[PDB]
Amino acid sequence: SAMEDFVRQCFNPMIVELAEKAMKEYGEDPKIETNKFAAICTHLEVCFMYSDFGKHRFEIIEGRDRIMAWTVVNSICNTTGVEKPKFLPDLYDYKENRFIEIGVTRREVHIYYLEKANKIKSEKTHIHIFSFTGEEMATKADYTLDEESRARIKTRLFTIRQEMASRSLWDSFRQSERGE
Ligand SMILES: CONC(=O)c1[nH]c(Br)cc(=O)c1O
Ligand SMILES: [Mn+2]
Numbered sequence: 001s002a003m004e005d006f007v008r009q010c011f012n013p014m015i016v017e018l019a020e021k022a023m024k025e026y027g028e029d030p031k032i033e034t035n036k037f038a039a040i041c042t043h044l045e046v047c048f049m050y051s052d053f054g055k056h057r058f059e060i061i062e063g064r065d066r067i068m069a070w071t072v073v074n075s076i077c078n079t080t081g082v083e084k085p086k087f088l089p090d091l092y093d094y095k096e097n098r099f100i101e102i103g104v105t106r107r108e109v110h111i112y113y114l115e116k117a118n119k120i121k122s123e124k125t126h127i128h129i130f131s132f133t134g135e136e137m138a139t140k141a142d143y144t145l146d147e148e149s150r151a152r153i154k155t156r157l158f159t160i161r162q163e164m165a166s167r168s169l170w171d172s173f174r175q176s177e178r179g180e
């Protein structure tokens, strides 16, 4: 498939390694579930771009094995007092002192927003949704990052989108709702 080839073409090795690991945690083959392969990679990259942009302001919980992810969640909760999320989130924002759930969607942002929000049902985890179209939605329209940092995520997402479309892989990808 050209999709696996493109995943290994545009995503640096670190992310692809982690993506295959998270794909085995579902008995899943990235050579078959390749749209999930790419979505997992893209999301991972968004989380990593977000953390680095914010003296470290964000703690990455995404990309950890579940033992260490929940260990970091628990350490944060016990030293700040934030409420234990029911589900593992993506970042902790030490500045606003909240958990952030990063959403990357091929659908409208408002829709995947309502989806994550209705799933988490704890208005104490901040949601920030990014599309491949330079659109973003976010709890209380608080976007956390400076405008520039968000420019950078949106440019990267739109670049994956155009690079998939130059390979004739974007119609398949947007017409899939896995990785979401
Ligand atoms: C293994 O834990 N799963 C996740 O963290 C996760 N899954 C999906 Br689908 C979309 C996300 O945005 C996300 O953060
Ligand atoms: Mn996550």
Ligand SMILES: [Mn+2]
Pocket: 043, 090, 101, 102, 103, 104
């Ligand atoms: Mn997420």
